[PDB]
Amino acid sequence: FATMRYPSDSDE
């Protein structure tokens, strides 16, 4: 399943 991390899982 895709993460809902901060800012995004693989942006910064």
Q: Are 2 and 9 in contact (CB under 8 A)?
A: yes
What tokens appear for 1 in the block? 């399943």
Cα–Cα distance between 7 and 3 in angstroms, integer?
Answer: 11
Residue type for 3, please?
A: T
Cis-peptide, bond into residue 7, ω within 30° of zero: yes
What tokens appear for 5 in the block? 């991390």
Method in brief = NMR
